Symmetry: C2
């Protein structure tokens, strides 16, 4: 239902097809993000999604996932689509900042915690 995944994939292809290095701005504060906090700045990390800087990159409707190496330390990165803030070309900044969609809001996310119930029955 959310359009963000299709728009991200569209820009990604346009970037790569034009020989641009696609940079993804991630809200490392969002629910489910999995990135090395050692490289996070002000609740925000910028990733390189080019073929070269990624292993097994997958751009799903629900998440971005890939193997990344930070100073020899290869590992997996998981980013829920709701955390993707923007994607642009490293060589010139051309890209898009994703428009907010109501569904990536925890209010629209199914109950993460249950209702106050008694105990006895």
């Amino acid at each position: 239902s959310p359009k963000r995944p299709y728009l991200l994939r569209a820009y990604y292809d346009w970037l790569v097809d034009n020989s641009f290095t696609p940079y993804l701005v991630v809200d490392a504060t969002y629910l489910g993000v999995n990135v090395p906090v050692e490289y996070v700045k002000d609740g925000q990390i910028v990733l390189n999604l080019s073929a070269s800087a990624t292993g097994n990159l997958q751009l799903t409707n629900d998440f971005i996932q890939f193997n990344a190496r930070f100073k020899g330390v290869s590992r997996e990165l998981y980013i829920p689509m709701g955390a993707a803030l923007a994607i642009y070309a490293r060589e010139n900044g051309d890209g898009v900042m994703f428009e907010p969609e109501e569904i990536y809001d925890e209010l629209n996310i199914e109950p993460d915690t249950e209702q106050p119930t008694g105990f006895y029955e």
Copy 2:
């Protein structure tokens, strides 16, 4: 390189197209039938414009290329094939609600649509 990057339209058209279909919507395309290179049933054009149904059941061998769109469709029984230059695709939306996107103008599309003031020899 003064940075002569290609148009984004084909990518946006394609993505929105996939979004509509994956959501059970019927993709409708608004075309400028004037645009150089367009091949569509001239008698179904209104105000130099034609709306087309691109859903799976309304098309055959649909091709959403960076440069053009092409497919086979039937108009009142008469099966015809259409060729549409990307600069001619003006918008794509969902029939079930009139909600979609109207593409932003892109400089090169305008260039590819500049007409000569006069004809060629012969």
